[PDB]
Amino acid sequence: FLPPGWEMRIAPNGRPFFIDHNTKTTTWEDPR
C-alpha cells in the first residue's frame, strides 16, 4: 500500500510528511 522507502511520519508540531528512504528526501505533498 505504501511504496518501499516511503514513510508517513509526523513532526512534533503536528505536521505530517512523507519521507522517501531510498532518496532520503522529505516530501510534503502526495506524489500519487
Binding site: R9, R15, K24
Partner: peptide, 13 residues
C-alpha cells in the same frame, strides 16, 4: 510555504 526542516533520520524501516 510550510517550513521544511533539513532531513533528520528518524527510526529506520
Amino acid at each position: 510555504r510550510l517550513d521544511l526542516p533539513p532531513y533528520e533520520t528518524f527510526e529506520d524501516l
